[PDB]
Design an enzyme around this catalytic site. Structure first.
Site, PDB file in Angstrom:
ATOM      1  N   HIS A 170       0.655  -1.123   0.666  1.00 31.59           N
ATOM      2  CA  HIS A 170      -0.150  -0.184  -0.151  1.00 31.59           C
ATOM      3  C   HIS A 170       1.015   1.434   0.060  1.00 31.59           C
ATOM      4  CE1 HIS A 170      -3.437  -3.155   0.774  1.00 31.59           C
ATOM      5  NE2 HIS A 170      -3.063  -2.550   1.449  1.00 31.59           N
TER       6      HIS A 170
HETATM    7  C1  ACO Z   1      -6.574  -4.352  -0.131  1.00 34.37           C
HETATM    8  C2  ACO Z   1      -6.570  -5.671   0.920  1.00 34.37           C
HETATM    9  O1  ACO Z   1      -5.218  -6.383   0.135  1.00 34.37           O
HETATM   10  S1  ACO Z   1      -7.396  -6.402   1.716  1.00 34.37           S
HETATM   11  C3  ACO Z   1      -8.183  -5.999   1.333  1.00 34.37           C
HETATM   12  C4  ACO Z   1      -9.212  -7.229   0.511  1.00 34.37           C
HETATM   13  N1  ACO Z   1     -10.279  -7.421   1.037  1.00 34.37           N
HETATM   14  C5  ACO Z   1     -11.762  -7.332   1.185  1.00 34.37           C
HETATM   15  O2  ACO Z   1     -12.262  -6.573   0.792  1.00 34.37           O
HETATM   16  C6  ACO Z   1     -12.887  -7.920   2.009  1.00 34.37           C
HETATM   17  C7  ACO Z   1     -13.172  -9.712   1.213  1.00 34.37           C
HETATM   18  N2  ACO Z   1     -14.927  -9.261   0.222  1.00 34.37           N
HETATM   19  C8  ACO Z   1     -15.124 -10.641  -0.069  1.00 34.37           C
HETATM   20  O3  ACO Z   1     -14.541 -11.412   0.447  1.00 34.37           O
HETATM   21  C9  ACO Z   1     -16.129 -10.255  -0.655  1.00 34.37           C
HETATM   22  O4  ACO Z   1     -15.703  -8.598  -0.946  1.00 34.37           O
HETATM   23  C10 ACO Z   1     -17.242  -9.833   0.825  1.00 34.37           C
HETATM   24  C11 ACO Z   1     -17.949 -11.036   0.200  1.00 34.37           C
HETATM   25  C12 ACO Z   1     -17.378  -9.093   1.195  1.00 34.37           C
HETATM   26  C13 ACO Z   1     -18.505  -9.157  -0.406  1.00 34.37           C
HETATM   27  O5  ACO Z   1     -18.801 -10.722  -2.019  1.00 34.37           O
HETATM   28  P1  ACO Z   1     -20.173  -9.823  -2.473  1.00 34.37           P
HETATM   29  O6  ACO Z   1     -19.606  -9.369  -3.913  1.00 34.37           O
HETATM   30  O7  ACO Z   1     -20.865  -9.735  -1.407  1.00 34.37           O
HETATM   31  O8  ACO Z   1     -20.857 -11.523  -3.290  1.00 34.37           O
HETATM   32  P2  ACO Z   1     -21.158 -13.014  -2.148  1.00 34.37           P
HETATM   33  O9  ACO Z   1     -20.894 -13.908  -2.457  1.00 34.37           O
HETATM   34  O10 ACO Z   1     -20.584 -12.678  -0.264  1.00 34.37           O
HETATM   35  O11 ACO Z   1     -22.636 -12.984  -2.195  1.00 34.37           O
HETATM   36  C14 ACO Z   1     -23.377 -11.473  -1.852  1.00 34.37           C
HETATM   37  C15 ACO Z   1     -25.130 -12.204  -2.582  1.00 34.37           C
HETATM   38  O12 ACO Z   1     -24.801 -10.992  -4.176  1.00 34.37           O
HETATM   39  C16 ACO Z   1     -25.353 -12.817  -5.160  1.00 34.37           C
HETATM   40  N3  ACO Z   1     -24.101 -12.024  -5.899  1.00 34.37           N
HETATM   41  C17 ACO Z   1     -22.775 -12.964  -6.061  1.00 34.37           C
HETATM   42  N4  ACO Z   1     -22.350 -12.547  -7.533  1.00 34.37           N
HETATM   43  C18 ACO Z   1     -23.537 -12.384  -8.115  1.00 34.37           C
HETATM   44  C19 ACO Z   1     -23.497 -12.033  -9.411  1.00 34.37           C
HETATM   45  N5  ACO Z   1     -22.127 -12.290 -10.763  1.00 34.37           N
HETATM   46  N6  ACO Z   1     -24.264 -12.000 -10.640  1.00 34.37           N
HETATM   47  C20 ACO Z   1     -25.253 -11.902  -9.087  1.00 34.37           C
HETATM   48  N7  ACO Z   1     -25.804 -12.043  -8.091  1.00 34.37           N
HETATM   49  C21 ACO Z   1     -24.503 -11.862  -7.740  1.00 34.37           C
HETATM   50  C22 ACO Z   1     -24.561 -13.821  -4.100  1.00 34.37           C
HETATM   51  O13 ACO Z   1     -25.722 -14.721  -5.194  1.00 34.37           O
HETATM   52  C23 ACO Z   1     -25.254 -13.239  -2.932  1.00 34.37           C
HETATM   53  O14 ACO Z   1     -26.714 -13.536  -2.564  1.00 34.37           O
HETATM   54  P3  ACO Z   1     -27.035 -14.228  -2.178  1.00 34.37           P
HETATM   55  O15 ACO Z   1     -27.564 -14.360  -0.860  1.00 34.37           O
HETATM   56  O16 ACO Z   1     -28.756 -14.675  -2.976  1.00 34.37           O
HETATM   57  O17 ACO Z   1     -26.514 -15.653  -2.623  1.00 34.37           O
HETATM   58  C1  LIG Z   2       0.716  -9.096   5.939  1.00 32.85           C
HETATM   59  C2  LIG Z   2      -0.547  -9.252   5.995  1.00 32.85           C
HETATM   60  C3  LIG Z   2      -0.980 -10.579   5.899  1.00 32.85           C
HETATM   61  C4  LIG Z   2      -2.818 -10.682   6.297  1.00 32.85           C
HETATM   62  O1  LIG Z   2      -3.528 -12.451   5.624  1.00 32.85           O
HETATM   63  O2  LIG Z   2      -3.653  -9.706   6.337  1.00 32.85           O
HETATM   64  C5  LIG Z   2      -3.231  -9.072   5.552  1.00 32.85           C
HETATM   65  C6  LIG Z   2      -4.400  -7.755   5.505  1.00 32.85           C
HETATM   66  C7  LIG Z   2      -3.820  -6.239   4.493  1.00 32.85           C
HETATM   67  O3  LIG Z   2      -5.148  -5.452   3.898  1.00 32.85           O
HETATM   68  C8  LIG Z   2      -4.814  -4.332   4.938  1.00 32.85           C
HETATM   69  O4  LIG Z   2      -5.071  -4.447   6.548  1.00 32.85           O
HETATM   70  C9  LIG Z   2      -5.447  -3.089   6.835  1.00 32.85           C
HETATM   71  C10 LIG Z   2      -6.920  -3.292   7.471  1.00 32.85           C
HETATM   72  O5  LIG Z   2      -7.585  -4.058   8.480  1.00 32.85           O
HETATM   73  C11 LIG Z   2      -5.434  -1.936   5.654  1.00 32.85           C
HETATM   74  O6  LIG Z   2      -3.833  -1.385   5.516  1.00 32.85           O
HETATM   75  C12 LIG Z   2      -5.781  -2.395   4.677  1.00 32.85           C
HETATM   76  O7  LIG Z   2      -7.181  -1.177   4.704  1.00 32.85           O
HETATM   77  C13 LIG Z   2      -5.969  -2.894   4.313  1.00 32.85           C
HETATM   78  N1  LIG Z   2      -5.814  -3.337   3.090  1.00 32.85           N
HETATM   79  C14 LIG Z   2      -2.720  -5.697   4.844  1.00 32.85           C
HETATM   80  C15 LIG Z   2      -1.324  -7.010   4.935  1.00 32.85           C
HETATM   81  C16 LIG Z   2      -1.488  -7.643   5.663  1.00 32.85           C
END
Ligand code: ACO
Ligand code: A1ACY
Ligand code: ACO
Ligand SMILES: *[C@@H]1O[C@H](CO)[C@@H](O[C@@H]2O[C@H](CO)[C@@H](O)[C@H](O)[C@H]2NC(C)=O)[C@H](O)[C@H]1NC(C)=O
Ligand code: A1ACY
Ligand code: NAG
Ligand code: NAG
Ligand code: NAG
Ligand code: NAG
Lengths: 547, 540
Positions: free
Chosen positions: B181
């Site tokens: 990040h």
């Molecule tokens: C930046 C970094 O490195 S850290 C940040 C990264 N991490 C994150 O953001 C957290 C992880 N996030 C996630 O796993 C996901 O975004 C979630 C699970 C929170 C949300 O996923 P969502 O898009 O809401 O879909 P999910 O599979 O959970 O299901 C939500 C609903 O949408 C529906 N849906 C999903 N995909 C579709 C699609 N393509 N078309 C129609 N409906 C759909 C599902 O059927 C469900 O409805 P239902 O209950 O009737 O079955």
């Molecule tokens: C190192 C690490 C291991 C893991 O397995 O998990 C993570 C998840 C991460 O994601 C970030 O975590 C923080 C929020 O908790 C914020 O810096 C950012 O919003 C978000 N992109 C970043 C690093 C890790």
């Protein structure tokens, strides 16, 4: 200042011409060398005796031998049992010289005060909190509207009890000495769950395999399923359960090859394959008599019984006959300072040597059960290679229990007769082996070596538990295993979960006093109740993870 | 040697006699950094033999070295250079005040050779390994036998791409600076994941709400489902995802309330409740009816955006300038040592306290900020809601004109162009300059618009190829797309476990970290694929 189960001992040396040294050794040590507790000096002048502070262990007993650094003569031998937090004062004076004990602060009486009263109070509090939480959920829903063959279930109850006890004693068990695994020999409440898990594994092996075969499935498909299940158990254990990932990334040079799940998988493969090859259909028309005194369940498995007897003979021969270099032949002791310390690097004897030879020192358990009492400096793994033979024997005893359960299904009196007979036979064998005494006997009860008397004692316990449970939960129906069978049906999920989620908040939180038994007990009971609740919730959702 | 990863050993030789030169260092990319002291070079004991000082200059991207005299501080040489990894550069300042930058050892790129052709090599290696494992495992079984309402899959592919990126950059991303990040302002590869997750979350919110309302249900069990899902997401984020349980047991006084899953749950609740409260059934070349039918939630989104802008640029903060977006620490010439986030940081520290916040913000490693600032704070949840609603608008566009594909691409292109124009107006096409610079930590409005324009373009590419023309199902991507929540919880729980993490021969190597993280991401894709084959999709 003081830690859990650790009384404070002050030695007042009224002597004026001797440098006393207080030795120490617990009662539960079989043959332990005395360890220096503290080196009290001589009184520089008469009237004011020299004093020093020492912390004596309280868990069980204490032997204090008084020696002088000059002449090395036992001025007095004191044998007492201390309390959890007790300001104990020991004064020795010349009258020849006798040492008397004085108590300045009364002990907390660990495990004496809580008894069943505190446990009942905690259970009531937890039940009330759960009921209030459940009622509050309906309050929000109302406010929003206002605003706008089947399973045995006795084996399941058995496995649920074992799982609850395992979750309690794995999380600490209140940090009590008897809710932890025994140091080397004897039995504690934490030494019972694993043998019961292997027993139930064998029972379920027979039940499931005979159900599959009588349902019309080929033996080769079941062989593939057994092989995949054992491989999955071994891999899951090695990669997930055995290593502590909080200490760093997993390196092969220090990977613990054997573990609980590896043992379960290996004995599952062996005994399930034995049953598969030597599989006979379950007789039904033979159950036409009243309380039949037939040995069908035993004589229908003569090849597997012969193989099990050969394996047991192999375990006995390797244990009592294999010459370990720098170690007495047939050594069952704990090493370290145990057995008078003459074999320090001999923890486990033949089993330890076999593990250290085939897998190496680094691929074993670095913190064995004996390391805290007998001060073993080597690595010994309770789930070693040699003990897998006795684990296989236990799994086959569970298979025999399953054969008893299924061969005679309508005749519940026959089931009870067989269970009582097998429990009595195994209890008599265990009494003959261990000679009733904890540390005496030919093969004393030992979880670390998985001793034959350990297997027989825990199998007799399992047979008695099944004797109690099968009528109550199956035939009579007086009890449905109300809080227990959900873990029984989600055993593998609960094991993997609590071995993965040990440190997570609902199962572990920061404690107000880390050296309090009641706080640890509350935390462990709450964590076990939460795991039971998780298993129950998954039961309601009918989510049963199976391998 | 003693040199670390992404560091270069800089030897300094001062041929000057009456000089007590000190060397001040400042990374190039930092906006306004104070010159931290790198090493102190003592006076040469005699002519001919200069004093030698050993320093490790951070060669992530560039380095500014300024040399001023210790006594009577006056700059003698201002040197700007882009150092290389494991470089033995020797600096020779000699009396003639002149500078030399002799390179005693050629640097190792560790970025081009590892992520240019070694990337394809590792892809071939993992493909061959997977093929061999698949063939050999079935060969043993074959030897014994011989001896004896519809999902779109475009949103799924988008979510799978985001999941692959998150698993790669969460494990370290090869420990590269551009797979982490960005320290405060700027956009990196790791900054692109979370906003796409929120965008897809909103799109799926609409795509599921429309189906449920068209089917047999009511907006009173849907409300219960939304509330329970939000509570479950918040609780999972607070309990499982947020704390680092390897350190020790959780405690109330030092638990991180904000989080990725907490933010997702709050924004899900807000936007889903908005759609439920203003739910209308779906019914076109330039109809624009999707933006008009959903006028109340658009008005509420505009009001919320105004609230976020007003709080960011107008909320007075004690010991901090009003409307502060800077990183604090030594940023902005160090005039604000504890001002990380400004309005957002102050709101977080006032409502949740300083102990319930992120103690290692992305600005700590470069701008040297000692305070705790949480990227998923309270102020930025408004922008999370705004981006989730942009995703909802993408879903409305995709569902309203289901039978008019050209309408779908026209609207996706129009929305991507509008959001990109808004982003380039807000940031003035500059990461650190402009009105609202791109910033994940603040979750800036320009960050929202830039990442929403990127998501709209990604949808514009994926929807025809994967849905309409059908040239390519999201073969390596949609398998995590159908198990997102399980994949996230799993890689948060199983970060240190063997398949995803093993001890490295040398931790200070980009190639080994990159291969470990690529193997871990591929293994997570394989796990998601296996679960798809067995149909074990975990929801809610
Ligand atoms: C930046 C970094 O490195 S850290 C940040 C990264 N991490 C994150 O953001 C957290 C992880 N996030 C996630 O796993 C996901 O975004 C979630 C699970 C929170 C949300 O996923 P969502 O898009 O809401 O879909 P999910 O599979 O959970 O299901 C939500 C609903 O949408 C529906 N849906 C999903 N995909 C579709 C699609 N393509 N078309 C129609 N409906 C759909 C599902 O059927 C469900 O409805 P239902 O209950 O009737 O079955
Ligand atoms: C190192 C690490 C291991 C893991 O397995 O998990 C993570 C998840 C991460 O994601 C970030 O975590 C923080 C929020 O908790 C914020 O810096 C950012 O919003 C978000 N992109 C970043 C690093 C890790
Ligand atoms: C000492 C300490 O403190 S640590 C203690 C050590 N802890 C442990 O070992 C816990 C880990 N072990 C376990 O969880 C379990 O013993 C397991 C999962 C390894 C094995 O449990 P099992 O007895 O094999 O039962 P499981 O639930 O896995 O089911 C296996 C088969 O038995 C069948 N089965 C189980 N119970 C019954 C029953 N009562 N009646 C009929 N069939 C049954 C199942 O149907 C299944 O067969 P199927 O797949 O063909 O339907
Ligand atoms: C404490 O003193 C007693 C008696 O002096 C020791 O008992 C004997 O010690 C000698 C060594 O000096 C041994 O050879 C004997 O075998 C011991 N027993 C008997 C019955 O004589 C005792 O060993 C001392 N404590 C420790 C820890 O050494
Ligand atoms: C206390 C504890 C913490 C933990 O982090 O997890 C555990 C897992 C345990 O299980 C035992 O661990 C040892 C080898 O695995 C052997 O003593 C036993 O055979 C086996 N049942 C026992 C205790 C713990
Ligand atoms: C006891 O030890 C002290 C030193 O710790 C020494 O000065 C003294 O002489 C010793 N007394 C006897 C009787 O050995
Ligand atoms: C123990 O008692 C002695 C005298 O009886 C006293 O001096 C000492 O402070 C006490 N210590 C504790 C820990 O209570
Ligand atoms: C180095 O000295 C010059 C002399 O004018 C000064 O301007 C500069 O700020 C100094 N660098 C520091 C203090 O980091
Ligand atoms: C850099 O070059 C110098 C040449 O004088 C050498 O002494 C030094 O060892 C080199 N650095 C490393 C890390 O080898």
């Amino acid at each position: 200042e003081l830690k859990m189960d650790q009384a404070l001992l002050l030695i007042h040396n009224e002597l004026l011409w001797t440098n006393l040294t207080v030795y120490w050794k617990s009662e539960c040590c079989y043959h332990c060398l005395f360890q220096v507790l503290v080196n009290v000096p001589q009184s520089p002048k008469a009237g004011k005796p020299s004093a020093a502070a020492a912390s004596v262990s309280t868990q069980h007993g204490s032997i204090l031998q008084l020696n002088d650094t000059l002449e090395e003569k036992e001025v007095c031998r004191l044998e007492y049992r201390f309390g959890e937090f007790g300001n104990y004062s020991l004064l020795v004076k010349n009258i020849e010289i006798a040492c008397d004990l004085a108590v300045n602060e009364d002990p907390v009486d660990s495990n004496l005060p809580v008894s069943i009263a505190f446990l009942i109070g905690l259970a009531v509090i937890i039940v009330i909190s759960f009921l209030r939480l459940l009622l509050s959920l309906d309050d929000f829903n109302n406010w929003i509207s206002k605003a706008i063959p089947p399973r045995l279930r006795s084996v399941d109850t058995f496995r649920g009890i074992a799982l609850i006890l395992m979750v309690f004693v794995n999380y600490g068990g209140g940090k009590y000495w008897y809710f932890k695994h025994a140091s080397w020999n004897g039995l504690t409440v934490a030494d019972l769950v694993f043998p019961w898990f292997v027993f139930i594994m064998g029972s379920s092996i027979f039940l499931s395999m005979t159900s599959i075969l009588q349902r019309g499935c080929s033996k080769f498909r079941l062989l593939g399923k057994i092989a995949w299940r054992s491989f999955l158990l071994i891999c899951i254990g090695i990669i997930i359960v055995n290593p502590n990932y909080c200490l760093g990334p997993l390196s092969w040079d220090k990977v613990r090859i054997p573990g609980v799940l590896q043992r379960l998988g290996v004995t599952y493969f062996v005994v399930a394959v034995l049953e598969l090859l030597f599989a006979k259909p379950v007789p039904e028309h033979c159950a036409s008599e009243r309380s039949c005194l037939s040995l069908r369940d035993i004589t229908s498995s003569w090849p597997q019984w012969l193989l099990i007897l050969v394996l047991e003979g192999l375990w006995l021969g390797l244990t009592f006959l294999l010459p370990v270099p720098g170690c007495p032949t047939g050594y069952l002791g704990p090493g370290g300072i145990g057995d008078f310390g003459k074999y320090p690097n001999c923890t486990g004897g033949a089993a330890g040597y076999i593990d250290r030879l085939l897998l190496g020192d680094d691929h074993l358990y670095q913190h064995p059960s004996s390391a805290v009492l007998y001060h073993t400096e080597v690595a010994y793994d309770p789930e070693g290679i040699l003990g897998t033979i006795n684990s296989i024997v236990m799994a086959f005893l569970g298979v025999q229990a399953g054969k008893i359960l299924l061969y005679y299904k309508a005749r519940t009196k026959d089931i009870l007769i067989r269970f009582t007979a097998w429990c009595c036979i195994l209890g008599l064998i265990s009494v003959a082996l261990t000679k009733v005494s904890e540390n005496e006997g030919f093969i004393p009860v030992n979880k670390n070596l998985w001793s034959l008397s350990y297997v027989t004692t825990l199998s007799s316990f399992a047979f008695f538990i099944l004797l109690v449970l099968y009528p109550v939960v199956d035939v009579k129906g007086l009890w449905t295993g109300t809080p227990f069978f959900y873990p029984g049906m989600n055993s593998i999920l609960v094991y993997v979960g609590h071995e993965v989620f040990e440190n997570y908040f609902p199962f572990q939180w920061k404690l107000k006093d880390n050296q309090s038994h009641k706080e640890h007990l509350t935390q462990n009971i709450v964590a076990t109740a939460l795991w039971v609740l998780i298993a129950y919730i998954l039961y309601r959702k009918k989510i049963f993870w199976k391998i």
